[PDB]
Amino acid sequence: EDVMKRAQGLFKPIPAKPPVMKDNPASPSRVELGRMLFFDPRLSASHLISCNTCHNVGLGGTDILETSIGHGWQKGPRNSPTVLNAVYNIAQFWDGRAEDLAAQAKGPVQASVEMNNKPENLVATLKSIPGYPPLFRKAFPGQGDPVTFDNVAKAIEVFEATLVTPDAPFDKYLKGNRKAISSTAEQGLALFLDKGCAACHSGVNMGGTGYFPFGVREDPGVDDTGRYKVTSTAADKYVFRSPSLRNVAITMPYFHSGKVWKLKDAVKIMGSAQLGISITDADADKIVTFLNTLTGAQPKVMHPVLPPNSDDTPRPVSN
C-alpha cells in the first residue's frame, strides 16, 4: 500500500549475509576465534561469566534479567541489549552526555568491564591457554604478538557480525510481500508510522540510530503505565539511545532500566505526551501485534569447544 511504501522508506530488511566490518575483515578462523571468546568464561575474573551469560544467544541475545553491570562505560546497572543485529546499531550505549558519547564509540564495545580494567590479565589469561595463541596467529596473520586486547575485541566483533536475524515476517513484508504480516500487524505498523514512533526507531535496525532527551523513569507524583513514564527535564545530564525494536518480543524486560516487563506496557509508556503521542489501549494492542512481527530467524550457534587451561592459567578469583 502506501503503508508498505512508507515502511519501505523508514526501514530496511536485515541482510542475510554478515555485514562487512571496516578494518576488521572476517575470515573463518577469526569468526571461529570470536565465537570461542564470546562463550569463554575465563574472560571474567570469576571464570564463570562469558559474553553469552548476559547476551545469551538462546534468549534473544540478552539475559531476560532487569539490569547488570557488564561494561566500563556504564554509570550504573542497565538492561543488557541484544547482541543480535547489534552490529547494525549506530548508537551503541544506553545513555550518556552528548559530548562523551562519540568518544565512547572509540570502543571497543566487545570488552566487559573486567577486560577493559585489566587488559593485561585478559592477555595473560589467553597466553596461558596453549590453544589460544595458535588461533590468534591464524586469525591475525603477520603480527608478531597477535594475542592482544584489541584483537580479542576484533575477533568477537566478526563473530558478532554473524549474529544477525534476517527473515522476520516484517522483513518479508518490507520486501514486498503484503501478506507476510496480518492486517492487524499492518494496522499496528500504520499507527507506528503515523504516531511518529518510526522517526526514533528507524532504518535497517529499526532503532539504535540516535540519542534523545527522553528516558523512562519512575513517576515521583498501581500499574506499570501509571508507575513509569517518559521523562525529560531541565536537570537531565544524560540522553538515551532509542533502541532497535528488532526481536523486541523476545528480549524483555524493556527500557534502559529493565524495569518494564510487558511489551504492551512499554508501548503504552511510549504513547507519551512528552513525545507528542497519544495512543488508545486498542492502538497499543495493534502496535504490539506489529512489534511481534520483528522477530527474526535466530542464529543457530555451535557452542565452542574451548582450549583447556594449562597449569599456568591464573586461578578463578573467589566466590
Added chain:
Amino acid sequence: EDVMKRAQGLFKPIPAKPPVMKDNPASPSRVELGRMLFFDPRLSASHLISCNTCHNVGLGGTDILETSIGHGWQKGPRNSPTVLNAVYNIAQFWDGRAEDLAAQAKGPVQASVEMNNKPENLVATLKSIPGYPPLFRKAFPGQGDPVTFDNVAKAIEVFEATLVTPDAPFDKYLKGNRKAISSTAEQGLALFLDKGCAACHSGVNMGGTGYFPFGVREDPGPVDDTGRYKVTSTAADKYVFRSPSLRNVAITMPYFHSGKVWKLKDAVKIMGSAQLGISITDADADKIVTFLNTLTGAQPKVMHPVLPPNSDDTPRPVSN
C-alpha cells in the same frame, strides 16, 4: 506544560566552559598547539588549506560554500558543518550505512583526508618545523616522542572544545528569561516543538544526536528551492543522514549535506515534509526562521596564531 518548560526538556544551553574531553585533558599549551595546527595550512599538501579554510572561525565555523572534500570518511563532496560546538555532536558524519557509522567514530574527526592518508608525512612536516616539537613536548609532557598523528588530533580537539558559542538568546530563554527571545520567536519554538522538529534536532546541541533515513535530494517530479528539493527516503537507500545541530544555523548557509539550499526559510519549508509527517504553512515557516535566528551564540574571539617557521628540510608545497 507550557512552551518554555517543554523547550527545557528538549534542549539544554551551551555551557560556557569548554567541555572536558575524555582521556584528552586540556591545558593552555595543548589548546595553543591545537590552535596553531587548526590554522596551519602546511597540514595540506598545497600548503594553502588549513582547517580554518573550510571551518572558518570568522564565518560561523563553516566556509559558506556548497561542498568540499575534507575528510577520509566522505564518499563525495559534502557541505562543511560548523566546528562551533561540534564537540557536542554525537553523530559526527553527514551520512553512511548504519553498520559503518559507529566504527567511523573511532576517528579522529580532526584529521583531513591528507592527514589521515599520510600520517608519517604529517609527522615528517611537523618534525621539520623546528618550533613544533618543543610545543608538542609542552602539550604532551612525559612522552618521549610527542609529535604524532594522534597527538595532532588531541591538540586540535582541545582547541576545538574551546570553540563553543554560549549565550544565544535562545539559551538565555532556556535558562528562564522568557523575554530573551521575541514573542514571534517563541511561537516559532512552539511550532518547532509541536510539529516534531525537535525530536531530531534535540539536546544540548539542538541536533547532531542521531541519523535518520531521510536526506534532501533534487525532486524528480514547478520552481523554487522548496519546489526543487525534497526530503526523500526510498527502499533503495544505502545511507542514513545525520540530523544536524541547528545552533548558529542562521550563519552557516548553505544548508543540508549537499549544501544545495541557500536560504534558511527554504531549508525550513523543505523540512515541513509529508515524509516526516509535517505540514507547515508559509507563515509557520517564517515564525520557525525567527526562532532559529535566536540560536546564534557568542562567536569565539580566536587569535590567529604565529606559526613556527619552516626549516630548509620542510617538505615543499604540492599543487595537483
